[PDB]
Design a protein around this ligand. Sequence first.
Ligand SMILES: CC(C)(COP(=O)(O)OP(=O)(O)OC[C@H]1O[C@@H](n2cnc3c(N)ncnc32)[C@H](O)[C@@H]1OP(=O)(O)O)[C@@H](O)C(=O)NCCC(=O)NCCS
Ligand SMILES: CC(C)(COP(=O)(O)OP(=O)(O)OC[C@H]1O[C@@H](n2cnc3c(N)ncnc32)[C@H](O)[C@@H]1OP(=O)(O)O)[C@@H](O)C(=O)NCCC(=O)NCCS
Lengths: 402, 402, 727
Amino acid sequence: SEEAFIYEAIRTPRGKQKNGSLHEVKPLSLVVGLIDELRKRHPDLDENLISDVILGCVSPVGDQGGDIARAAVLASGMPVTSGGVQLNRFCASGLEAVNTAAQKVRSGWDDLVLAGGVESMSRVPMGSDGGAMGLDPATNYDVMFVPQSIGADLIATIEGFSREDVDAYALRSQQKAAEAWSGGYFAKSVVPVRDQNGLLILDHDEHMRPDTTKEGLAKLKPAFEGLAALGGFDDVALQKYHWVEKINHVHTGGNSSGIVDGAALVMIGSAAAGKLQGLTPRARIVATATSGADPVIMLTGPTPATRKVLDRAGLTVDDIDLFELNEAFASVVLKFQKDLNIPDEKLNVNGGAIAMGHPLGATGAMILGTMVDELERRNARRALITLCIGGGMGVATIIERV
Amino acid sequence: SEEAFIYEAIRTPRGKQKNGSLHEVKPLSLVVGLIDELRKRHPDLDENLISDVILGCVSPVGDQGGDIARAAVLASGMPVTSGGVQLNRFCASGLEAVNTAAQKVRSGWDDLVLAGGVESMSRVPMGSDGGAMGLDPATNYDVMFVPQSIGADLIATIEGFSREDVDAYALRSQQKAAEAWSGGYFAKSVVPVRDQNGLLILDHDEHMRPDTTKEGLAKLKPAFEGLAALGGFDDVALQKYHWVEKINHVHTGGNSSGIVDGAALVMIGSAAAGKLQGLTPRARIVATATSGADPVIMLTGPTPATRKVLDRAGLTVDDIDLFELNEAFASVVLKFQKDLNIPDEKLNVNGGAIAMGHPLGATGAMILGTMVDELERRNARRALITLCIGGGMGVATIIERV
Amino acid sequence: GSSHHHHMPDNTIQWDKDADGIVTLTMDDPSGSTNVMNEAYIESMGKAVDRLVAEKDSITGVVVASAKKTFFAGGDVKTMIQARPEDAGDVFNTVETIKRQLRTLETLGKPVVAAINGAALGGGLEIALACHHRIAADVKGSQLGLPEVTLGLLPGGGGVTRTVRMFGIQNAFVSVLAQGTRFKPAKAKEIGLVDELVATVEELVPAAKAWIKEELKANPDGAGVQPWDKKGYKMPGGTPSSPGLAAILPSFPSNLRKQLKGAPMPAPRAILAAAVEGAQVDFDTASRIESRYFASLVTGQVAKNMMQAFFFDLQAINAGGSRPEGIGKTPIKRIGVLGAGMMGAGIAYVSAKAGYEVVLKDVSLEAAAKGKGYSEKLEAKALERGRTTQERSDALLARITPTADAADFKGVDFVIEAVFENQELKHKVFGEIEDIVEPNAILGSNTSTLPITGLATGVKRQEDFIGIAFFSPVDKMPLVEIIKGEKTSDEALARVFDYTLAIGKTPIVVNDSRGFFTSRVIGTFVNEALAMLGEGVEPASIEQAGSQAGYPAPPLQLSDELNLELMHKIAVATRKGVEDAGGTYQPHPAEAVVEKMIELGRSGRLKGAGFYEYADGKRSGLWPGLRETFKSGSSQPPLQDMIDRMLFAEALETQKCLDEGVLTSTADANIGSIMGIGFPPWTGGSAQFIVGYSGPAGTGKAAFVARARELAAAYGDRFLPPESLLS
Ligand SMILES: CC(C)(COP(=O)(O)OP(=O)(O)OC[C@H]1O[C@@H](n2cnc3c(N)ncnc32)[C@H](O)[C@@H]1OP(=O)(O)O)[C@@H](O)C(=O)NCCC(=O)NCCS
Ligand SMILES: CC(C)(COP(=O)(O)OP(=O)(O)OC[C@H]1O[C@@H](n2cnc3c(N)ncnc32)[C@H](O)[C@@H]1OP(=O)(O)O)[C@@H](O)C(=O)NCCC(=O)NCCS
């Protein structure tokens, strides 16, 4: 019925894990800093119309526990009627919050909703919340738990992606991300993090290594060789994939996503709420979809999820101008490209998590706003955003520029 | 556009905290046990049509961490395309999962969704996930954090509800819950928990004290007197509510909700998905709403949330046959009744959390299915379900029998 | 409803209280020579525990001792094997009652000492684990452990819950629970199963009473309190919620699935699950979780298979089931061995290690020194640095007297030939000392394929000629396949049957037939894999199907040790054996695959090239040329079809051996397939597989022939069940 439009899409810079600039900033401050930025852009915005604040978070414990979305509503001085809910669909939590907000708007029961994510991996490390799929032996043994990194090497092993093939994409991600920052592509959407006194803490994605060379990547060691050997996870993966003889471990620290801190926030609302608040729509949510695939390799979810959202919107691969898949591992992007036969020119055009980092709960909302900017910058129409999810899930979203 | 209907609504019995029957059952098993029960009712159900499994959980840590909704999809043998997402809006997480599932159906982008909740407080105690609103001094000091129990006594102090007034409602809840079990009101929706061998673990709500007397309740001590004195939370609450001289502590273990283990699950889908799967709709989701009120007393959220969902559906208080507010504390129900002038005969007609317990993440879905049964049992049409939420939030849902 | 009694048996416990107030519960089951956790024990212990609570005001300590040669040995196997899933409630209540008695004895407020005099296995050790102090007599033969996993069970009498509480999740699982390893009294004291040791059994109970008198005076506050019952208990290695253990905890089920290779053995999974789930809750709640997992195993089909094989079948073998009835025990003086190979020289090891004064001879003294050299650098170089009694290797080495053809094997009562499998060579070899050994002497032969009846014609006393087939390595393989010739006397079969028991091995009796039993049945397993490779199945899938089925080595890997040229010689010999008999030969589809591999020069590990690659004595991966040679990938059947094809081939063929009279009991078929053919232990043997099969068709013998006809309709008429199964 009522269409869902994106009015704003902002994010913080991503601070690295070791000696990072954002290590001293608690996760709640990253969300409040973005709420304050949304206030600066629309001072006349009646915040009582905002009925919900939906934040994705993958480790909702410690600094990120106790429904951090509601803590951000109260700490930022938002009206007490603005809701606040935390969700976790692993690495797609950021995009799931956007889809849920768009679906809440499309139901007519919500007018204006804030969606986003937040993840401070330097303060709240991944896996701090536990879980049965890993810590409960009965379910670990039955589901055949295999870490995502082992599934990424198995994807390169099955598809024949060599160490040079994945390092080639890793080099490209550093280049496209470096050219994106130098060209001012991110100046309007990356909100510098500042302290309570206004002093600058971080204004750029400090995980990037713009001087990356193909020779320097070949000198790195496979970061998941000891994990597969001491943990026996290679033997587990090959029992499910029995026709594969040996797993080729090709992923290192240079072709995998970075562990970083960051947060993102998007504003979604109906066309009636936009005209009532004087907001100009940037893009329209065309369709959302949730699918999945085998959880042992875990990282082949984007392919059936992308096909489903294309059928829901009644479109093909040729009808989309920009494809944005999160760069959890290099082989995931190469496999998604081979599955749907996507040209290399329209896939993660401004670099991705390999260069700028992967803040779990926030990444889905970060790359979504990244595509909103590129649609308006290139004057293109449609863009598709998808991420691979733990447990073999998949979420995809199609947006159209307005 | 597409209407959302409830096809099934089941729950487990609630096991108590001390020497409880469900203490030995991990939270994942409670959800899998309900998924298996939904399979028994519809063996010909094509589970590939199920696109999402949305579970509310307030302490998503340890046994309940790592997206337990996805763990339930994989452990129960559901298709890998069935999604799985955990959300937390405190005590309303169970109903929020239902509302989100209904809103996902109403957007047309999801056909059939499973929604519910799960909370094993005997294994994962409340507050195990941390949070900034309580553990971060800057935000604790600014928001003026006051525990929910202190806000409940302040509600009785402001509204003039005496110790006998709240103990009177507590007695009634035990009576209505005892009459509900004896009359077989819950035989069709309470699914007994069994072990892997089929042996019975629990088949009834063991927190109930059916032999409660008004004299026995008056002999109980205020369970939150030492919390307010040693913590100074009474002084904090009275700085915000300066016209109140002293807080009358009336809530004890007999007029507050019980700490129990339990899980609930509801099946929501469009009318097209019902006829395609041979499912008969039990009730239709009329409207959902999210509002809020002051977070210091925290427990006055249901009143503005109920008025909002009544305006969205274009109805009045007289148009609803059954009101179901979670019995977090006795004064919350008495205040909600005084706010909207609701007759005592149509408010929590089958007893509530004071007698049967309050499993945080699952309570919203439990009382929702409780109202689905009473609408069909009484041949009534409309029912309104709402819960008070931490941080002063409020969520309400209106359902119509089909 | 909740007591120490299960809902008129004989009493098995003797009560004794001294003036000091110390009660001595002496376990002495009248019906039997060993204390077993049966119905008589449950009622007797229930009464004694009730009396400990009633007289608690006049009791200061408890000593749990035994009157048998051993301490206590497990539970009643004959009852547990009959437990069906309909009896899950009765199983649950029974183990709950047993543990409730031990828990009451444990929380009695008084020190309880276990006087472990002999072997404490299974439920026996669980009784001692319920005590607060354990004293063991340092005597050899007193094993201690929880071997329930070997029977498809778990220590359901508190063994899982208490060892985890004592050692933590990782140590108790890896060292105690997962494999059910058994320890010597000195070794159990080292890890911490028992607390102190005594020299003699007579000094055991007085030391138990002495420890109680000292524990009451030294530690009166913590007297009779277990560590996990004290406030402030910290589990060694942490709880599942501890950050150190939670970091490595996801690797525990993966490493277990790595060791089991994906085989469907549910007991180790249930042990690990119960151990970790119990570590998250209080002791009593942990005990209950352990009971539900125990009931899950006993009512299952896999535990019935292993109890049938590793208890009933193995006990029937050692009971002389296949031994000739009514034959006396003839003595044995010297032994003559003729073999210096890996398997020939190993035969002289197990015989000299039991005291026999063997005489090895293999051509000239050079090969005999090499044959004696197999025991050298291994009899003590890799053995003296071990456990106990390494200074007694003289009697185990001075007995063996290696010589050459110069010695005529003077005064030898037992001959065990182990030369190369050559007919004409084996005839004249035994004829060199046919009239030189004792007048009454056994003439054994370690043959694998050649018919033993034809070999007997090379000697006059054919009644004393018999096949005695060992397995490499002889020091580690426990099966001995005894092949009965046409004219082999029963006195000879009885003498060889008694020899295998003194060696410590497990014998099976087999009548002379083509391929006997082990070699014939193992050939169908290997041939089934080679046929799948010719059909186009990926070689990686074939190796995984073999490992996940339960075999100790995948089939293509096994086809490299069993040289392909040697496999081809078996094929041409079986053809000439049936054609010269008048019939017509139908080649197995695996032959065309073998003939192609030998054509490429890849005969196996011996040459250094086969299905795998080999370099510097180490096995590499599969040969990359297999995918283009046999069109790997053009055939993708279900993995369970690959597994069943290999399991049913050995199951149907072992049935034919029973039909043809090759085997005389299913106990020989089960034990023979487990200890010689490598058949998966979870099946309980190649014969038990047909009566305990479980799949989409159902369970039992009727489901076996249904699945067999399904495999026959899709993979060839060779999977049709024999008429003896009554299809
Ligand atoms: C891959 C991973 C283990 C690397 O962690 P790390 O070792 O701390 O990473 P670093 O990059 O800091 O260090 C790796 C090494 O490679 C080097 N390196 C990394 N990228 C490089 C590049 N582009 N050029 C040159 N060197 C590079 C580093 O300098 C370092 O070498 P050094 O230690 O001598 O300095 C980690 O990033 C990871 O696990 N990724 C996250 C994936 C994931 O699981 N996410 C989803 C969770 S649900
Ligand atoms: C109120 C609360 C502290 C009580 O905890 P508790 O002391 O463990 O509760 P119990 O009922 O087991 O014990 C209270 C006493 O009252 C008694 N009692 C309780 N209900 C009774 C009744 N209906 N009739 C008679 N006695 C009753 C108990 O028997 C006990 O007395 P005892 O200790 O001598 O046996 C606890 O239930 C609570 O905090 N409620 C949850 C509210 C909440 O915060 N939920 C939302 C979290 S976001």
